[PDB]
Write a protein that binds this ligand. Structure first.
Ligand code: CLA
Ligand code: CLA
Ligand code: CLA
Ligand code: CLA
Ligand code: CLA
Ligand code: CLA
Ligand code: CLA
Ligand code: CLA
Ligand code: CLA
Ligand SMILES: CC1=C(/C=C/C(C)=C/C=C/C(C)=C\C=C\C=C(C)\C=C\C=C(C)\C=C\C2=C(C)CCCC2(C)C)C(C)(C)CCC1
Ligand code: SF4
Lengths: 107, 706, 37, 139, 29, 161, 62, 80, 30
């Protein structure tokens, strides 16, 4: 309640280190309005070690998506009829992406 | 098909709504009428001028009549310091009971408007004291308008129609206007001041009923012919003198005191009299004196553009000299009308100057004959036209990048808690001039600040007697005669400079490219105003000379805005005796946003609210009114014809297919506004809104705190 | 790829990254330079 | 001639077509032979079906008849479209092709209307033609 | 002012009122 | 004292710009722990103001009524560091950027495909131009005297008149 | 007399390449007006590099 | 209606003629050579003023020029 | 008193007359 949600410490240069304001506790930074502190508290995160691996886990997921984009155009590109399968794509995103995504997040 | 418009048969055959709009626009454009010969053209101009003159006469008769009938001139004359001048009565049936109690101000029993035109302070100085002298002015101007209206009709009758040669007889006109119109009128105005203005300022009433009996000077008109002119510089008025009475009054009628009367904080009437007498002599002598100059004489647009430029320059001059050198009694004391008078005349001046270049561009497309114009100043400016435009482009860019850059620099540095890091340049060249004129504040100590300098001593004839009166006023911190300036004034002056150069650039490039450019080599064949030349050749929107004026109207408003924004905020501190607010906040733009616009809009924005309403509800409504019509102009400027023409087609369809409405029909087919029309309509809304918004704020913000 | 680095946006960004970071390091060791002493 | 009446295509629609201007002055008609039963976009909305025909369509502007006539030559390669403009409440029969040959092709017997025997830089100044009945572009 | 001076001024203003109509219908022709 | 401006070492208002600045930060330091990381962040911030003001007193700047340093551009040699000395410092760097890109485009235009060499930057030709840009006040003088700095107005493309 | 491949400068004031240097593509060997086809390195607003001129609008800068 | 003039710099490319949406222009035999063709404007009463013709002309500065004039039902492109 | 009579004449009645006079003048024809 009292301590305001803050990130983004600003470097000690020409005077923009006045943006690192008295935000709460023993910290000086920019008070953020993104809701990430209330979102991570709802997710259960209590230490910054759990925030650290999620940042590493997002970078390997970024490289996995970047590898999948290279692979599915340069190396193994689907045909036109694989894209026009709308009924299988509706089946899979409803069950897998939306169903198991809300099943496992409930887990 | 139809008779309207009479002036243009091709518009008259247009079956759409465009006909009416264009028939209104192409109406006072006499040159483009059907069958209009050169001789017929000039006679129409002349007569139109009489009509305009009459309107001017009727207008100032209406200001006299309404003041005499519904003002408080007689009450004001008694105590100019505390009486609020009344413009006219308020008769708006939509008012309620509490709103009538709010506008029943200035000690009146009816709702009325507090005047801000300064007419009370102008009429007072001339010698008017009672309402009956005001009414006598209104009836006289009614006759002069009727004399103007009859004359216009008269000089249109066969036996009295001036010949073509008479209108183009240039040398005769300069002699008669400088001699008569300027000279003898100025001489006559000297007559009014010594015989009426000066007597009424000394408590003696002089009117038509007695002026032939009383003398303006104890033993006047024998020294005038015998050369003893110095007797009229006898005992002036003392510093103790109270304007409008005989206590401390002198008898001089022509003097050279200089400075301002200590009570009214304005020029001495006797000093104004000598000025006009001298000016009269100059014009009467100059009036006995009377290729490029022939092309001035055959083009009405060239003359008008120069006459607009000449009027535009001196319109700015009137504004600059009236705030620093107050010429009307108690006009320096009423701060709101001094704010109104500077802003009003500066905006007019901006329109005239922009208009001057507009009619100049019209001359180049419709009147400039390039074969009959070779190897002279005109055809040489077109010859290196790209050099002139490119340099004008550079100065604008130069001025702009750096003035905005310093403001952005200061803003950041002030935002970060370090005001000491700002870049503040002292206006040393300007502060030098003030010391050259006598301001002993900066201590530069050369010319009229140096007490032994030749300009103050003048050992040739011992002339320099204007110096005592002038130096007292320029050194006392009680007026606006060469106001103290600092870093804030430096930046704005370059912003104003940026505005004057960029506005001139748009107008100069438009005029010099009016006849043609690479994107449109035959531009002159399409006239001053045409939509464009289609999407070909890359795109040609806003390629006509008219469109260049159109873009320049945005820059002048911005320029005159920065001028008026500066004048108002600076004087605001000066009038409150707390000059520190402007001096420290004007060097960064957040100061102009927090301490000028937001701060001074506190009362204005509260003219009416959920708890009541005060005497500023009108200005508060107008303020919102201005914002809405400003923003309405953006609609025509951003959205173009095509969207609307297709939308209108669905409305035509809908009307024709709906019973009980189908039954009736339009006589003119509905169509979207034209390409040129929309620019004009958008700009007109924008600029009416621009001025109406600032007028509401300027008047209400200053009248609230004084 | 070195041919790609000579193309105008990427060669116009890293020198804009260099000319910025020059002024970032200059204002870091030498702060508050209004005038030449 | 116009061969009115001819079978209008099987359409049934278009709010956006042929309103009160048509009954007072100057509506237009385009007549072609469609050698199939295909669907084609209209200038108003899009479908009708082209008849075997003798096909005929009444349109509002001459613009829409060439914009439809460009579609029959592009998509369906039937270049025998014949636009018209009607009798008493209209003006002039047989608008296109006026010489029987398409206007992009040269045909002997046509006359040069609207020609100028100069360039545009050789056009005189508007000040030279001030207060006169002559035009700056006309020869 | 007086009440009779007002109606005197509206009596004078017909002379510009007619002469403007006489000029404007002459400027139209 | 050129416009009524006392120097900043003698300005009593410039000293009070120091007094409220360090009072706004020592009150900002009163709530933190003395050994913490925001403690040394404000103490390094306070000492940046002390190196700000003590630089501005000894530099010979002119403080007005508000207490801020003002710059005097009429250029005098007692106040040359405000505008005159950084003015010559700007023009060399700005002329180096100008004469490099002008000489680069002249070298590029006399080639096969000059248009692609505005997209791709030839690092030999660009480094050849920055060698010609360091000597721009000497190179432009002989380019102007020999007459190949400018073209005549019959060689430039020009609108119809 | 201007041959093909020669460098000219254009005297036509309404052209985009007025007072600019171009090279001739070809000369038409008949009595057609404006036979001199000059090809330019600069494109105009219609992005075309060629135009027809007469002999009076070209010179022999070489 | 609008006026459409054709200047003597025409190279008979037919591009303008094939750009016009209302069939205002056509190619006609030239007598200066009896070999080439020049553009013409025999139906200017149907010209809407779109300027598609000029945008198709290849010559450096137009051989066909459209000067917008008096507007009519046909020229305003009204279906009503 | 005369304000109460005149400002609905030139505010309501007289603009209704001149708009009536200008509208018939526009849509007349020969
Ligand atoms: C344009 C880019 C953009 C950006 C930068 C943001 C930024 C943010 N979003 Mg928002 N979001 C966006 C677009 C964007 N949003 C759009 C278009 C939608 C509608 C689909 C959302 C829906 C959304 C929700 C529901 C939530 C956020 C939240 C947030 C904040 C936390 C970041 C986070 O990782 O939460 C991670 C996201 C969650 C924890 C919630 C995800 C639950 C949703 C329902 C999953 C839906 C996924 C599915 C594929 C999309 C629907 C497809 C369907 C139409 C077929 C952050 C401010 C969160 C917040 O408010 O923080 C306090 C939050 O709860 N966003
Ligand atoms: C059941 C397994 C499964 C899962 C978890 C997904 C999940 C996804 N697919 Mg889908 N997809 C699937 C099966 C699945 N797909 C199948 C079987 C097909 C072929 C019929 C597709 C065809 C498909 C296409 C064409 C696209 C996706 C896309 C996506 C992504 C949506 C973006 C987002 O919300 O995050 C999401 C990761 C989108 C994407 O991000 O592509 C990379 C996208 O464009 N999918
Ligand atoms: C879909 C994601 C998901 C996953 C991966 C798990 C996984 C697990 N659950 Mg959980 N659980 C889930 C959703 C999930 N659950 C949901 C939706 C419910 C509500 C029905 C539960 C209610 C639940 C209970 C009551 C218990 C588990 C337990 C378990 C653990 C052992 C069960 C097993 O191995 O078989 C395992 C870690 C057991 C456990 O060990 O909890 C810590 C256990 O007692 N689950
Ligand atoms: C419901 C909105 C509304 C309306 C209809 C009015 C109406 C009026 N107010 Mg206003 N007023 C209003 C709201 C309104 N008020 C509000 C909210 C306030 C703030 C509380 C005021 C404060 C106020 C003040 C202080 C005064 C008025 C006055 C007036 C009267 C002006 C009489 C006049 O000369 O008109 C004639 C109108 C004009 C001369 C301007 C119109 C110019 C036109 C539109 C420009 C275009 C001309 C062009 C050629 C068009 C052709 C016209 C042709 C066909 C005739 C009129 C009755 C004044 C008054 O009492 O006068 C006796 C006055 O002094 N009002
Ligand atoms: C140009 C306009 C003008 C006109 C029509 C008059 C007219 C007059 N003046 Mg005035 N006067 C004028 C300008 C004018 N003056 C100027 C410019 C000055 C300053 C030099 C004066 C200073 C002046 C004095 C001092 C006197 C007059 C007097 C007179 C009256 C007698 C003239 C005479 O006898 O010979 C006559 C009504 C005499 C008089 O008694 O007025 C009734 C008189 O004594 N005039
Ligand atoms: C005394 C000086 C003077 C004279 C004699 C003229 C005369 C002329 N000008 Mg010029 N001009 C002038 C000054 C002058 N102007 C100024 C000061 C400017 C800058 C604004 C211009 C800029 C200019 C341009 C760009 C053009 C002219 C044109 C013309 C010609 C036709 C005007 C016409 O019929 O428009 C018709 C009149 C109107 C459409 C007036 C309606 C617009 C007004 C401003 C609306 C006002 C808004 C509203 C009523 C406000 C109400 C208040 C609100 C709160 C409700 C005519 C020769 C035109 C021309 O082609 O010349 C050959 C032309 O294109 N003038
Ligand atoms: C805050 C908004 C803004 C800003 C920063 C600018 C900035 C500029 N304008 Mg623009 N302008 C603006 C709004 C603005 N304009 C608006 C609303 C209009 C009306 C459409 C214009 C119409 C306009 C014209 C016609 C011209 C400029 C020009 C300029 C440049 C002047 C050179 C300089 O000052 O440095 C500068 C980049 C000039 C230019 O670019 O010359 C090189 C120029 O000729 N402006
Ligand atoms: C265009 C007008 C303009 C001018 C004349 C200046 C000038 C200056 N600024 Mg300001 N400033 C500007 C715009 C401007 N700035 C803008 C637009 C912003 C917002 C981004 C700022 C925000 C700002 C801050 C926060 C600070 C400055 C500072 C400075 C000073 C530089 C001190 C230094 O160490 O550099 C010396 C540089 C060199 C010796 C090397 C120059 C060679 C470079 C690398 C070439 C780059 C070419 C590309 C100098 C007086 C600093 C200062 O000390 O103020 C007192 C400072 O802290 N400026
Ligand atoms: C500038 C001229 C002007 C004047 C003098 C007025 C005056 C009036 N308006 Mg306003 N009004 C105006 C312009 C004007 N309006 C404009 C431009 C708008 C658009 C913004 C409005 C929008 C507006 C609305 C929405 C309303 C008014 C109302 C009123 C009346 C309030 C007091 C009242 O009801 O008395 C009590 C007296 C009566 C109710 C009867 C008075 C006489 C009536 C109007 C006519 C009687 C018929 C008569 C025999 C013949 C008709 C006259 C006609 C042919 C000229 C007052 C008479 C209110 C009203 O009552 O409307 C009628 C009202 O609701 N006005
Ligand atoms: C000193 C001073 C000052 C003054 C200033 C002045 C007054 C100046 C002027 C100036 C001027 C009046 C100038 C002129 C010029 C002109 C010209 C004519 C120029 C030209 C140029 C050129 C030609 C360029 C070139 C180049 C180079 C060199 C390099 C780069 C590139 C380029 C190309 C850009 C002041 C007060 C501010 C301050 C103090 C100091
Ligand atoms: S319609 Fe608009 S976009 Fe098209 S040429 Fe005219 S101004 Fe330009």
């Amino acid at each position: 309640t009292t301590i305001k949600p803050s990130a983004q410490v600003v470097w000690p240069i020409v005077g923009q280190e006045i943006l690192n304001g008295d935000v709460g506790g023993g910290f000086q930074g920019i008070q953020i309005t993104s809701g990430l502190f209330q979102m991570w508290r709802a997710s259960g995160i209590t230490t910054e070690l759990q925030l650290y691996v999620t940042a590493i886990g997002a970078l390997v997921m970024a490289a996995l998506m970047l590898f999948a984009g290279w692979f599915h155009y340069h190396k193994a590109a689907p045909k036109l009829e694989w894209f026009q399968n709308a009924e299988s794509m509706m089946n899979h995103h409803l069950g897998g992406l939306f169903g198991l995504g809300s099943l496992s997040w409930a887990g | 098909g139809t008779k309207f418009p009479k002036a243009s048969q091709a518009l008259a055959q247009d079956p759409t709504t465009r006909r009416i709009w264009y028939g209104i626009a192409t109406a006072n454009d006499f040159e483009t009428n059907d069958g209009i010969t050169e001789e017929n053209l000039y006679q129409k101009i002349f007569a139109s001028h009489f009509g305009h003159l009459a309107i001017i006469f009727l207008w100032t008769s209406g200001n006299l009549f309404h003041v005499a009938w519904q003002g408080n001139f007689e009450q004001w004359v008694k105590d100019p310091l505390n009486t609020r001048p009344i413009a006219h009565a308020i008769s708006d049936p939509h008012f309620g009971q509490r709103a009538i109690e709010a506008f029943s101000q200035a000690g009146a029993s009816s709702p009325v408007n507090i005047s801000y035109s300064g007419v009370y302070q102008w009429w007072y100085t001339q010698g008017m004291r009672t309402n009956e002298e005001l009414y006598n002015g209104a009836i006289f101007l009614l006759i002069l308008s009727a004399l103007s209206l009859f004359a216009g009709w008269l000089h249109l009758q066969p036996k009295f129609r001036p010949n073509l040669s008479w209108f183009k007889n240039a040398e005769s006109r300069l002699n008669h206007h400088l001699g008569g119109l300027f000279g003898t009128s100025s001489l006559a105005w000297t007559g009014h001041i010594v015989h009426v203005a000066i007597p009424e300022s000394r408590g003696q009433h002089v009117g038509w009923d007695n002026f032939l009996q009383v003398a303006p000077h104890p033993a006047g008109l024998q020294p005038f012919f015998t050369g003893n002119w110095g007797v009229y510089t006898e005992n002036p008025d003392t510093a103790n003198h109270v304007f409008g009475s005989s206590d401390g009054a002198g008898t001089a009628i022509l003097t050279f005191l200089g400075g301002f009367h200590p009570q009214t904080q304005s020029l001495w009437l006797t000093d104004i009299a000598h000025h006009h007498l001298a000016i009269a002599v100059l014009f009467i002598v100059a009036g006995h004196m009377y290729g490029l100059y022939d092309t001035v004489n055959n083009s009405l647009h060239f003359q008008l553009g120069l006459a607009l430029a000449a009027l535009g320059v001196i319109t700015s001059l009137v504004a600059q000299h009236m705030y620093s050198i107050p010429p009307y009694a108690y006009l320096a004391r009423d701060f709101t009308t001094q704010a109104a008078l500077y802003t009003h005349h500066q905006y007019i001046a901006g329109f005239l100057m922009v208009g001057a270049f507009a009619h100049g561009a019209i001359f180049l497309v419709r009147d400039y004959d390039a074969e009959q114009n070779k190897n002279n100043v005109l055809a040489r400016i077109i010859d290196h036209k790209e050099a002139i435009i490119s340099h004008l482009s550079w100065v604008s860019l130069f001025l702009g990048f750096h003035t905005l850059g310093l403001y952005v620099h200061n803003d950041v540095v002030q935002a970060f808690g370090t005001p000491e890091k700002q870049i503040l340049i002292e206006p040393v060249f300007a502060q030098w001039i003030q010391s050259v004129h006598g301001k002993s504040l900066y201590g530069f100590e050369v010319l009229l600040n140096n007490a032994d300098s030749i300009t103050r001593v003048a050992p040739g004839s011992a002339q320099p007697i204007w110096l005592p009166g002038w130096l007292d006023a320029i050194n006392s911190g009680n007026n606006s005669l060469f106001l103290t300036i600092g870093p804030g004034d430096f930046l704005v002056h370059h912003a104003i400079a940026l505005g004057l150069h960029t506005t001139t650039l748009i107008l100069v490039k438009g005029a010099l490219d009016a006849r043609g450019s690479k994107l449109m080599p035959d531009k002159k064949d399409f006239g001053y105003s045409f939509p464009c030349d289609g999407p070909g050749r890359g795109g040609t929107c806003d390629i006509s000379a008219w469109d260049a004026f159109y873009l320049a109207v945005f820059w002048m408003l911005n320029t005159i805005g920065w001028t008026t924004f500066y004048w108002h905020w600076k004087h605001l501190g000066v009038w409150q005796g707390n000059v520190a607010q402007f001096n420290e906040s004007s060097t960064y733009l957040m100061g102009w946003f927090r301490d000028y616009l937001w701060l001074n809009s506190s009362q204005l924005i509260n003219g009416y609210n959920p708890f009541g309403m005060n005497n500023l509800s009108v200005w508060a409504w107008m303020f919102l009114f201005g914002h809405l019509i400003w923003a309405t102009g953006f609609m025509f400027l951003i959205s173009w014809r095509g969207y609307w023409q297709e939308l209108i087609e669905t409305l035509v369809w809908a009307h024709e297919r709906t019973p009980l409405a189908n039954l009736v029909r339009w006589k003119d087919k509905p169509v979207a506004l034209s390409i040129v029309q929309a620019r004009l309509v958008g700009l007109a809304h924008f600029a009416v809104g621009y001025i109406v918004t600032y007028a509401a704020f300027l008047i209400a913000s200053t009248a609230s705190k004084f | 790829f070195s041919k790609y680095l000579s193309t105008a946006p990427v060669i116009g960004t890293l020198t804009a990254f260099f000319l910025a970071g020059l002024l970032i390091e200059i204002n870091r060791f030498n702060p508050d330079l209004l005038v030449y002493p | 001639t116009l061969n009115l009446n001819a079978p209008t295509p099987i359409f049934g629609g278009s709010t956006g077509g042929l309103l009160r201007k048509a009954e007072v002055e100057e509506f237009y008609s385009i007549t072609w032979t469609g050698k199939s039963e295909t669907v084609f976009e209209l200038p108003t909305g899009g479908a009708a079906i082209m008849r075997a025909g003798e096909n005929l369509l009444r349109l509002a502007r001459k613009e829409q008849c060439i914009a439809l006539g460009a579609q029959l030559k592009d998509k369906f390669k039937i270049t025998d479209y014949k636009i018209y403009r009607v009798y008493p409440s209209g003006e002039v029969q047989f608008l296109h092709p006026k010489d029987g040959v398409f206007p992009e092709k040269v045909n002997p017997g046509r006359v040069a209307v609207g020609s100028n025997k100069r360039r545009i830089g050789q056009n005189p100044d508007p000040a030279k033609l001030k207060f006169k009945g002559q035009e700056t572009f006309d020869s | 002012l007086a009440d009779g001076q007002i109606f005197t001024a509206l009596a004078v203003a017909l002379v510009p009122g007619i002469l403007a109509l006489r000029l404007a219908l002459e400027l139209y022709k | 004292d050129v416009a009524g401006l006392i120097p900043c070492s003698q300005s009593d208002a410039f000293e009070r710009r120091l007094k409220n600045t360090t009072q706004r930060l020592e009150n900002r330091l009163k709530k933190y722990e003395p050994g913490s990381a925001p403690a040394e962040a404000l103490q390094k911030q306070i000492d940046k103001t002390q190196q700000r003001f003590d630089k501005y007193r000894n530099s010979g700047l002119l403080c007005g009524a508000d207490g801020l340093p003002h710059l005097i551009t009429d250029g005098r040699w007692s106040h040359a560091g405000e505008f005159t000395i950084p003015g010559l410092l700007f023009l060399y760097i700005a002329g180096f950027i100008g004469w490099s890109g002008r000489s680069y485009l002249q070298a590029v235009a006399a080639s096969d495909n000059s248009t692609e060499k505005e997209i791709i930057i030839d690092i030999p030709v660009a480094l050849q131009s920055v060698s010609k840009g360091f000597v721009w006040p000497l190179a432009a003088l002989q380019e102007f005297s020999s007459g190949k700095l400018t073209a005549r107005d019959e060689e430039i493309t020009i609108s119809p008149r | 007399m201007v041959q093909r491949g020669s460098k000219v400068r254009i005297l036509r004031k309404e052209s985009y390449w007025y007072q600019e240097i171009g090279t001739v593509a070809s000369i038409d060997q008949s009595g057609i007006k404006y036979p001199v086809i000059v090809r330019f390195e600069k494109v105009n607003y219609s992005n075309v590099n060629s135009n027809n001129f007469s002999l009076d609008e070209v010179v022999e800068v070489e | 209606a609008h006026t459409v003039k054709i200047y003597d710099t025409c190279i008979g490319c037919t591009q303008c003629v094939r750009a016009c949406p209302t069939d205002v222009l056509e190619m006609v035999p030239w007598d200066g050579c009896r070999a080439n063709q020049i553009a013409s404007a025999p139906r200017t009463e149907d010209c809407v003023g779109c300027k598609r013709c000029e945008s198709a002309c290849p010559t450096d500065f137009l051989s066909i020029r459209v000067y917008l004039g008096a507007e009519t039902t046909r020229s305003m492109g009204l279906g009503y | 008193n005369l304000p109460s009579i005149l400002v609905p004449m030139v505010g309501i009645v007289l603009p209704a007359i001149v708009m009536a006079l200008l509208f018939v003048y526009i849509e007349t024809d020969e």
